[PDB]
Structures are given as structure tokens and as C-alpha cells.
């Protein structure tokens, strides 16, 4: 029953938008200028960003401790997500904590996506903007750390999704069999199963006219794995070029 599946695919609607402050649709608002009291305050250089600062220890490294306990509040928002889908908290405990592990970046980098264009990302929940080209101008190594997160946003949001499409997605990329060392794999596949049928439906549904979608949203996953190994080739560097720099506990565990 296709039914049993719209009820799945609003109940993850429902929950995505009580567990995340900037959906996607707040996001475009913002960026497309809908506004007159939405307009974001834009960075783009060194004073910019000290005004910035006023109307909202090197710059390098406050950009990043700034990125830092911005993800970690992400997770934190995903990790309430997760609860929500019918049977997470159902699973081992070991099983849960393997699957946020695995699935928390690869969600960040979706939802990040939301918040960019070509040109840059919204930061400070929407009242600021950086420009991507600011951004790439930092000291080695921190230069080109979002280059391949703006290069995948342009490519994803070429699909057009909106907030309850990515609900879905980001459902069906939580529950994931496949995860090193899953101690019960089958309940997961279950619950997966269902989840990608009701994205494809929803899919079909909200994107009538737009042939094969459904596929081509499964192929950016590969892409989100991509992005991953990267940023977690590019800590490795920042490690030994930053003694004094500290990671996170939450996200130095989620690593180890
Ligand atoms: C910050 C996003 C970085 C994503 C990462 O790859 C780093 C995450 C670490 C990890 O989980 O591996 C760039 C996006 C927006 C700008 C962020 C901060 C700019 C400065 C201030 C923003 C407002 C408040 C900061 C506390």
C-alpha cells in the first residue's frame, strides 16, 4: 500500500522539520532575496569579516573552530532525527552508535548543500553569508577545505529536492547495512527497504516530470563518500600542522 508509504514519508516530513532550525526552503528564501527582513550580512574579506563578527588567533583557524561546533550541533539535530525513524531506537544500542558514526557526515554535507550556491554558504543560522572565493584564499592547508563541498552542492542542487525529499534521503542514508561492523544487518535492510520506497514514491509524486530521479539521487551518495575520505585525508594534515589546535571530543570519536 502506497498509502502506508505517504504516511511514512510525512511522519519523516514532520520530524525533519521539528529536529532541523534551517530547512532548505528558509535557506533559498534567504539566498534568493526574498526578503526584506531576511538579507544575510556578507563576508568576503578581512574587514568584512571583523564587521561581521560586531554585527552577529589567527582567521584561518576561527573560521574552523567556527565549522567545528557548527557540526557538532548538526549532530546533535541529526542524532534527534534518527530516533524519529520507525525502529532506529528498536536496534541494538551498538548498532545505533555504529550507524550515527557512518552517517552523520555524509547527512551534514546534504543538508550543506541547502545552504549554498555557487558563490558561497550561509552561516550563523542565516544572518550571515561567506563567499566561497573568501573562503578558498585561507593559509595551507585550510585553503581549499570547502572547495569539494561547494562542488558537490552545485551538482546536487541541480536536482532540486526540497525538504521533504530530503527527509527521506537522509533516512535511507542513516539506515545503511552495509556499515563496518553491524553486529544485526537485516533489521536495518528492513527498515531501508521501506524507506526507499517511500522515497520513490514521494520522488515520483513531487517530481512527475522529471524521468529517473530516484537513481540519480542513489548515485550521489557515491559522491557524499567521496567528500568524506577527503576531509578526513585533510585532518590528518591539520593534526600535525596545528599542535595547538584541538578537534572536538564529539567529532574526534565519530573519526576514531
Ligand atoms: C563550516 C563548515 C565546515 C564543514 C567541515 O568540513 C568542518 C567540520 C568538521 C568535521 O565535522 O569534520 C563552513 C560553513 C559555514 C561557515 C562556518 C563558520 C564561519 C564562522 C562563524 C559561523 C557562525 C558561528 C560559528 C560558531
Redo the contacts with the bound molecule.
Sequence with gaps: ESADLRALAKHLYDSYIKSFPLTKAKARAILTGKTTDKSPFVIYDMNSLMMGEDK?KEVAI???????????EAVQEITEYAKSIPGFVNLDLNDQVTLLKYGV?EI??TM?AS?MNKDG????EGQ?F?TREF?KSLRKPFGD??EP?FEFAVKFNALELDDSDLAIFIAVIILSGDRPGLLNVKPIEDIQDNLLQALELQLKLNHPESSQLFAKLLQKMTDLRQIVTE?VQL?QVIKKTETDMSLHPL?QE??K
Aim: proline share 0%.
Design positions: 552577529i576561527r573560521i574552523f573552530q567556527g565549522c567545528q561546533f557548527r557540526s557538532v557526515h551534514i554535507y550543506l545552504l554558504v550561509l552561516i550563523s550571515g561567506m573562503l577545505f570547502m563541498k576531509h585532518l567529532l565519530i573519526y
